[PDB]
Amino acid sequence: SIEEQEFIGDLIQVNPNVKAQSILDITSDSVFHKTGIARGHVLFAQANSLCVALIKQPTVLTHESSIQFIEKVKLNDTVRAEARVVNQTAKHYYVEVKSYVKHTLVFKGNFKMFYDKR
Amino acid sequence: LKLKKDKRREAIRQQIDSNPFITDHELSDLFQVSIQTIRLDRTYLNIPELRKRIKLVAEKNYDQISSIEEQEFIGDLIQVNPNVKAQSILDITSDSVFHKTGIARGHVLFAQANSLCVALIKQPTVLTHESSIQFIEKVKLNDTVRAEARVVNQTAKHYYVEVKSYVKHTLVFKGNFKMFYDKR
Amino acid sequence: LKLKKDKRREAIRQQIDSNPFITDHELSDLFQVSIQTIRLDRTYLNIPELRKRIKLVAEKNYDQISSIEEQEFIGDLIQVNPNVKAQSILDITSDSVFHKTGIARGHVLFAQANSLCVALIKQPTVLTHESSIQFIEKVKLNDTVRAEARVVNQTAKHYYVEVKSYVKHTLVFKGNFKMFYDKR
Amino acid sequence: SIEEQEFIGDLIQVNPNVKAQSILDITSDSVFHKTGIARGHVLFAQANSLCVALIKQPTVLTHESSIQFIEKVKLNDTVRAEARVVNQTAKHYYVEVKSYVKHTLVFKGNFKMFYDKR
Ligand SMILES: [Cl-]
Ligand SMILES: [Cl-]
Ligand SMILES: [Cl-]
Ligand SMILES: [Cl-]
Ligand SMILES: [Cl-]
Ligand SMILES: [Cl-]
Ligand SMILES: [Cl-]
Ligand SMILES: [Cl-]
Ligand SMILES: [Cl-]
Ligand SMILES: [Cl-]
Ligand SMILES: [Cl-]
Ligand SMILES: [Cl-]
Ligand SMILES: [Cl-]
Ligand SMILES: [Cl-]
Ligand SMILES: [Cl-]
Ligand SMILES: [Cl-]
Ligand SMILES: [Cl-]
Ligand SMILES: [Cl-]
């Protein structure tokens, strides 16, 4: 169940502290059974868990985010999430994630992530 | 001076009929008896513990909705008026938090909020198009987050939903949701 | 793009079934149509104006209680769970206020609060023994004060009730009530 | 109806700005019909409207009050309320009211009244 998972998807390319990509197969757990359509929060968890993974800081907490679910994702798609750090301050990393199915943008998020060295 | 047993028990049944989510502790303070007394009173009355009562209230709610089912729904659906407003609670357990700090991961609260909005809308097809969210306070291991969803606009193609999430009385999460829908 | 008439009307009926106290203005903002449209929709649906809907909801409530009757009750009793919690609203009119300032007299809000506590408790005999009250903000001509009463303790002889009163979302009045009761 | 009345009872003695007494007959409007017992708020309105009456200030607003309903008042009683000013500051008058039926105390209130010269 999505809320009980740490990192969602498989990491396939990572450049620590800079950018990363993960892939996620869309199985029947991730969709509504009558339509076959992925649940927004599965794609969100992939994007947000990717940001947390790539940021090399002891603690990383999501402060804010804006997301668009641009296309319907379907049972049996593979969603490639591509994350990159746009800016970094003393307190935040600003991270953009664009997720694809083959070559069509299906999801875009902006993440404002808090961090600290504890 | 304190209530006779039979009067106290009638009064417990009434409290619970009116607020199923009232705790043993709160009942205890209400009647100025021990938690033990409240527990023994529940046993006599066949009133299940709080967590069982929540799952029972929620079962009734899953029948009122259509966009999502119990198996997929994140948290327990405690209150629903389809197309108008809804609430859920989510107990935050060890799998939802970082090991060192005990803080809930970002996607946990979003997952509660998004499924609440999906559940809220009773149309053949429903899905989130856009969302905007803020994490207002750290949520912690063993907290219960109560999410409140309400419809604020409805167009031909979208429901705009506003979500506020609480731990006790503190606001911890806030989100706007643009819900796409279609009757086909 | 906006809802077809028949869809809008279904959606109005649902909004009102779920919150009888929703205003034409609020319905208007919800569906992004004019107040005129909402009014004409109510007429088509035979939904009475807000104030009529309040008196109707309240009639049902007077049957649930026993300590007080409609004729004596100050305000309209909008929500009641006997021995647990209740709410009323009171429209503040010219007779309740000073001429120069338009401020509600002290005893008006106390009168709403006291009858709410009396109404709340469902015992043969009920009366206030003690009360402690604060007037937190000036209440004004043509405001609606919403009073919220809840039971916080029950002994063999008393219900302790806590009252909070609001104008929109501002707290304006606060009171503790020690209610005597007896079953004879 | 009590909330639609300005001054409750008849004034029978007044010493402006200092102390006053009023009497109130308890008719069937002021009681619950099944018990015959006066409503707390009728006695409160008598006490509080008496304070407001006796204070000689352009505006007088009740800020706080503590009251005790010491005896049951009954249909056909006359309640004599006796009010007096205990203290006065630049912003408040502190007023005590004790109300009687014949010679038995049936009600006691303390009132903290705000005032201003507008
Ligand atoms: Cl780096
Ligand atoms: Cl979704
Ligand atoms: Cl930067
Ligand atoms: Cl793109
Ligand atoms: Cl008893
Ligand atoms: Cl409990
Ligand atoms: Cl005990
Ligand atoms: Cl439990
Ligand atoms: Cl908690
Ligand atoms: Cl439509
Ligand atoms: Cl209205
Ligand atoms: Cl219009
Ligand atoms: Cl109206
Ligand atoms: Cl108002
Ligand atoms: Cl003087
Ligand atoms: Cl009373
Ligand atoms: Cl003085
Ligand atoms: Cl005395």
Numbering used by the authors:
A (entry chain B), D (entry chain B): 72 to 189
B (entry chain A), C (entry chain A): 6 to 189
What does the paper say about this structure?
In order to shed light on this fundamental mechanism, we studied S. aureus FapR (SaFapR) a transcription factor that senses the levels of malonyl-CoA, a key intermediate in fatty acid biosynthesis, and modulates the expression of genes involved in fatty acid and phospholipid biosynthesis. FapR has been shown to globally repress the expression of the genes from the fap regulon encoding the soluble FASII system as well as two key enzymes that interface this pathway with the synthesis of phospholipid molecules. Like most transcriptional regulators in bacteria, FapR is a homodimeric repressor.
Interestingly, in three out of four crystallographically independent protomers the repressor has the same non-productive quaternary arrangement as observed in the structure of malonyl-CoA-bound SaFapR, with helix αL bound to the lateral face of the EBD, strongly suggesting that this compact structure likely represents a conformation of the protein in solution. However, the helix-turn-helix motifs display high temperature factors or even partial disorder, and are engaged in extensive crystal contacts, suggesting the coexistence of alternative conformational states in solution characterized by flexible DBDs. In that sense, in one protomer of the crystal form 2 both helix αL and its associated DBD are highly flexible and could not be modeled, suggesting a marginal stability of the observed quaternary arrangement. Moreover, the first visible residues of this same monomer (positions 72–77, connecting helix αL with the first β-strand of the EBD) adopt a conformation that differs from that observed in the other ligand-free or malonyl-CoA-bound protomers, but resembles that found for one subunit of the asymmetric DNA-bound form of the repressor. Similarly to other homodimeric proteins studied by single-molecule or NMR relaxation approaches, our crystallographic studies suggest that the two conformational states of SaFapR (i.e. with EBD-bound or EBD-detached DBDs) can be populated in the ligand-free repressor species.
